[PDB]
Design a protein around this motif. Sequence first.
Motif, mmCIF file in Angstrom:
data_model
loop_
_atom_site.group_PDB
_atom_site.id
_atom_site.type_symbol
_atom_site.label_atom_id
_atom_site.label_comp_id
_atom_site.label_asym_id
_atom_site.label_seq_id
_atom_site.Cartn_x
_atom_site.Cartn_y
_atom_site.Cartn_z
ATOM 1 N N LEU A 235 62.556 86.836 62.836
ATOM 2 C CA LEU A 235 63.334 87.723 61.769
ATOM 3 C C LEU A 235 64.962 89.141 62.774
ATOM 4 O O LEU A 235 64.826 89.912 62.080
ATOM 5 N N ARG A 236 63.387 89.482 64.193
ATOM 6 C CA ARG A 236 64.428 90.628 64.555
ATOM 7 C C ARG A 236 65.137 90.105 65.240
ATOM 8 O O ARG A 236 66.655 91.043 64.988
ATOM 9 N N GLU A 237 65.842 89.428 66.038
ATOM 10 C CA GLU A 237 67.316 88.896 66.346
ATOM 11 C C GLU A 237 68.142 88.681 64.719
ATOM 12 O O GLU A 237 69.491 89.260 65.075
ATOM 13 N N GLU A 238 67.187 87.632 64.335
ATOM 14 C CA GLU A 238 68.263 87.393 63.037
ATOM 15 C C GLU A 238 68.574 89.069 62.322
ATOM 16 O O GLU A 238 70.150 89.494 62.215
ATOM 17 N N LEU A 239 68.116 90.233 62.239
ATOM 18 C CA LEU A 239 68.141 91.590 61.761
ATOM 19 C C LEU A 239 68.953 91.711 63.138
ATOM 20 O O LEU A 239 70.237 92.606 62.404
ATOM 21 N N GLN A 240 69.404 91.924 63.850
ATOM 22 C CA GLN A 240 70.370 92.512 64.593
ATOM 23 C C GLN A 240 71.496 92.006 64.457
ATOM 24 O O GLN A 240 72.468 92.648 64.449
ATOM 25 N N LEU A 241 71.995 90.370 64.395
ATOM 26 C CA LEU A 241 72.860 89.765 64.356
ATOM 27 C C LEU A 241 73.493 89.844 62.948
ATOM 28 O O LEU A 241 74.902 90.459 62.330
ATOM 29 N N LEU A 242 72.371 90.005 61.948
ATOM 30 C CA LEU A 242 73.483 90.684 60.532
ATOM 31 C C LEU A 242 72.974 91.906 60.047
ATOM 32 O O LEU A 242 73.594 92.739 59.125
ATOM 33 N N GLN A 243 73.222 93.351 60.600
ATOM 34 C CA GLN A 243 72.831 94.888 60.643
ATOM 35 C C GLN A 243 73.527 95.093 60.975
ATOM 36 O O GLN A 243 74.263 96.213 59.873
ATOM 37 N N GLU A 244 74.626 94.863 61.841
ATOM 38 C CA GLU A 244 75.715 95.066 62.075
ATOM 39 C C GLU A 244 77.542 95.610 60.678
ATOM 40 O O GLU A 244 77.406 96.428 59.784
ATOM 41 N N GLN A 245 77.473 94.006 60.479
ATOM 42 C CA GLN A 245 78.331 93.724 59.706
ATOM 43 C C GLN A 245 78.082 92.828 58.964
ATOM 44 O O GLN A 245 78.285 92.587 57.317
ATOM 45 N N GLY A 246 76.747 92.907 59.013
ATOM 46 C CA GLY A 246 76.085 91.593 57.942
ATOM 47 C C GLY A 246 76.626 90.332 57.919
ATOM 48 O O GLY A 246 76.560 89.571 58.332
ATOM 49 N N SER A 247 76.745 89.576 56.463
ATOM 50 C CA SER A 247 77.712 88.035 56.223
ATOM 51 C C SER A 247 78.450 88.491 55.165
ATOM 52 O O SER A 247 77.680 89.318 54.410
#
Lengths: 318, 85, 191, 50, 287, 70, 286
Positions: D1-13
């Motif tokens: 959840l931490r890493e996935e949060l990092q990929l969705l944090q900037e621009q989301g999806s």
Amino acid sequence: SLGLGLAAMGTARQDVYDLLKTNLYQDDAVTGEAAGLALGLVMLGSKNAQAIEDMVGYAQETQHEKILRGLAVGIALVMYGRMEEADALIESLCRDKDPILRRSGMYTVAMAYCGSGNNKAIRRLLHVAVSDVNDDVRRAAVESLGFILFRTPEQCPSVVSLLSESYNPHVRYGAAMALGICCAGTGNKEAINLLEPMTNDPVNYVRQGALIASALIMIQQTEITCPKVNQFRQLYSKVINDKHDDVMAKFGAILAQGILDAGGHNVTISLQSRTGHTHMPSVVGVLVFTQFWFWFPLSHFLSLAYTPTCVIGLNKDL
Amino acid sequence: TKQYEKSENDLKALQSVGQIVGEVLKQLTEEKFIVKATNGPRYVVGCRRQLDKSKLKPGTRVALDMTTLTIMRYLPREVDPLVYN
Amino acid sequence: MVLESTMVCVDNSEYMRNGDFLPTRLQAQQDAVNIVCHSKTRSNPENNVGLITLANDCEVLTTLTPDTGRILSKLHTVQPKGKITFCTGIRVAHLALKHRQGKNHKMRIIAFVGSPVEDNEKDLVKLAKRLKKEKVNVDIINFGEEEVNTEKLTAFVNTLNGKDGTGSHLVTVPPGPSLADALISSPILAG
Amino acid sequence: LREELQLLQEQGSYVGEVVRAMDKKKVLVKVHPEGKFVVDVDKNIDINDV
Amino acid sequence: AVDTAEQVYISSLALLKMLKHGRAGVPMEVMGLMLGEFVDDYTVRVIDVFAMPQSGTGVSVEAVDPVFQAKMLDMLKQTGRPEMVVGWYHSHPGFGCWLSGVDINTQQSFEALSERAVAVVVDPIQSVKGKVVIDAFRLINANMMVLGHEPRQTTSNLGHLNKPSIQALIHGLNRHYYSITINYRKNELEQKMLLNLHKKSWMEGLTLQDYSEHCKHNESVVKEMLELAKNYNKAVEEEDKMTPEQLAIKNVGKQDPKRHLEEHVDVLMTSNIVQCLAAMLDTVVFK
Amino acid sequence: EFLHAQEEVKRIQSIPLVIGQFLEAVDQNTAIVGSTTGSNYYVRILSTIDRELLKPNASVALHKHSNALV
Amino acid sequence: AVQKVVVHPLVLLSVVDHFNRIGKVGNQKRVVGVLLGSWQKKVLDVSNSFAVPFDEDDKDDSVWFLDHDYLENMYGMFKKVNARERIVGWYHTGPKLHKNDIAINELMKRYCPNSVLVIIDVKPKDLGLPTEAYISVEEVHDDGTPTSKTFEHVTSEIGAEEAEEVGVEHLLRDIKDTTVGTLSQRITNQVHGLKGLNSKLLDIRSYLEKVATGKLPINHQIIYQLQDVFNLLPDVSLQEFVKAFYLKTNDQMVVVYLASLIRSVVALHNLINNKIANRDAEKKEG
Ligand SMILES: [Zn+2]
């Protein structure tokens, strides 16, 4: 004092113990490891009384961590092959609340039981590898497995396979190191198999650990030994020529190329002579080489671990 | 001569940027307040310790922080066309 | 300038309410406090002077401080009724002198004793030998009425210090009417 | 959840809508608040399935 | 000239004051001052933390009051420990603790008086509880831009500190700044009591008081609270008895969920609390 | 350490948050939700509660930058 | 008046660390400082505090003196940085107060109308919840003696708000938390009997000791009255306590039945879904 102590290692000299105590009272941490390791080198296997009393008596009031680590391997190194004679001190080492002193008990119990399959040590060894709060002591805890079990390399892959899957990369690092140092005298393929996914972990330094461990399993062994030799040799250069990778991970890459090529491929490391006795300059060199970050000149002690493998047909005399 | 230095010291206080206006919708708890900027977005945020929960009440115009997005100072009402009327 | 911390002790004992000193011992010793506080002001700015009440239960009204406003404020409406207490009146000053910021400042105490004391000779000799170890020098000025030609306090000051220590000087007031500002003339000129 | 949060944090999806597909492997994608875009393969999903 | 890996030793008293001073300033950024001792270049320790008074202008290089410092240092000199100040810290409540143009303006002021002057940032918001939280920074020299900027030695702690990276704003400080590691020290005695203080807080004073008050509760309205549990067990179970039949309709565990599902675990745990606190009756009431 | 991990998932993202409009749960661990600004977003759902309070149509709080389902 | 007090671990630590300040310089006595409290209701709360230099002479064993100017300046700084904080009383680390501490309150009573003194313990030993809280009141007496000032006990509890819970729970890294429903209630169940016993046993040894040594008073008055109150309860059947038996068991009746009700359901979902996911998933692989 590292040159004096390594030159007089195992000689049990007297005058070196004189200036090593005033060097211990200099209160500087950068010379703390100097006095601490030298004190263990010259007193190796002598199980001196006043040496430990002065060291473990100086651990309390000092404010430096490098004097505590230098004294960690100091009191570790004076006690060699003493079996249960050192348990009286080991109890007091791990019972104390000092993180570094609990880290010291690990190296001590390591060298005292090297070559012994004594299961009485693995109780506290393993218990402290898990229930302890500090991560560095949890790494250095499982590194002792490869020191005691070097004579039976077949057990390490089996038992440590599940510790290599641990959630923290500190225990995964110690777990790669155990298979590295213990199985280096063997061509066991199971150890290599468990060290394949280790370089794929997204954690940086654990990949480094896999590099050096895989470098110790392949010493003097060409591609015809195990099929992963070239597989790994392209990976070592690949990780060091990519700018995106961490500088940390690419340190151990070229270092591993040095392991495989050590002595021009002509020499290897052997902790167990064929006579049945462990080689102490080999063991001591590699065990100090365990942590190369904390002191970079400590990477040179690995040169003593290199032993020549050759057929000498000298008949007699010259 | 010294009055100028009084003004220049006022500039030192002008180094503090403004805030964004917003209306108080409701409060989920004492740590959760639902506020809505005049722009349309909604935000669930907290509040400082100078304000009273009873004095806030829903449907109150307040100023939100530029970053924390929390209430600092409030105003009872404002209207720009009426002054002309 | 010489570095030290002086501690003044105002006499509120029930024998100070009489008007033998002009106009009254309250205002007489009050003016004494004014002249000593201005004397320390003219000496060194770093020297600080607090006050302590000897009568009844000793309490520090003003902690050691370089400003005399608080001191002059506490001299008023002091309600001088009670029994004099001496043996603890030096030790309180020493107690506030152990909490001092400066270690360079020497410990100095001045006190005004205007009433007889019940302290035995053995108690005062123990405090004399104790103040020798603590090196504390106390300059006492005797006021009011006591044993004619006060003896116990005089020998207390002589046996408190020695070689030289130049020192602690106890000035006893002679039994005659005079203005207080004229009585402080001899001590302020020389110790 | 931490890493996935990092990929969705900037621009989301984002949420895409395909108005048309092109033979160049690039698919026209339209976002509701935004304008019309077009984006290339996308190898995990076959072109004929789009 | 010599650049090495660094380490911060914090005191149990220090962090507690950090997050408090920071909590009272929310949203507005506060100004604290770090207190401790410089043992060498590669290590540092903070033995104390004291709070500065707020100002209407806010965080600024002039926000440190010299007369306030001499006064406070008077109070610390007469205290058992008169140690020199070391550095400064400031709270960053609403964002990811990046050093702004105001922070750099006071960095060069502390670097001339103090050689190190470790910059520390603490925020309560970014962490619920159990995180190590806080942060730490250091100003690299900008005039060194011609020479090698790339130390350190003992890169272990460097590798663990630069990680995770962790977004962008965090990476925007890699230039002109570098962080510095933080590790707790014990001080395990007072830490042991500090655990037992909060844990015993839930316990009673006499310990026979609130347990016997839960024995007064053991029959209240507990027969009525057991009627609450009885309604949860009827209402959740007659709709969870259609689920074994519905599993044959959907075939089998495809999404789903409903729900209305499980929740009997909490019912059994509350009923077990009821029966155990009720079992205390025969122990307490009797003798 | 697992109970200590629960606090790791509750730490994110904590406060502050932005209101969003939930649309539909496309699959496990992720669903599409509309922002208050009007932009529909593909979002990972928080791990703890995926089900009971989701509801077809409900207002839901999201992070400022990530717009994550909390 | 005052009912209970709440003392945070932060301020408590602030007493302990000052004990390390004067610990190296020594020597005798105990740490004495002035407490900063926060009063939002009849319940009392403490947030921070500040130490003050204090020394007690021995001659003079009842001589006590504090720094008033330093008190003014430091309280002025804390009033400057925090407007809500104010002095609620004073504190000392004890471990046991002395008769001289009665006047210490009377000094600072000019600062606060009612000053509550809080004992603390720097070295945790016994017998349970730490520290202490005393309030200064005058109950006179039925004897008509001059008014005697005796401090009365106020129940204390350790607490916090939000940020102060963070660091406290973070620094332990020792024992499980909590965990409610399993090991939270049983451990405290033994704590109830253990902390009940040792409290009762030390105090009941005191009662037997008070009549041999410690007279006077001691006993009387407060002793005999509470003695008879202790003899107010035997306390068991006869009679109705016999009738509470079967209704206590009858409260267990439905609870055991609900137990066995869901036990079969757990075994249901687990065994059904697992045996299917075992053999039917393995048959496709081999
Ligand atoms: Zn800032």
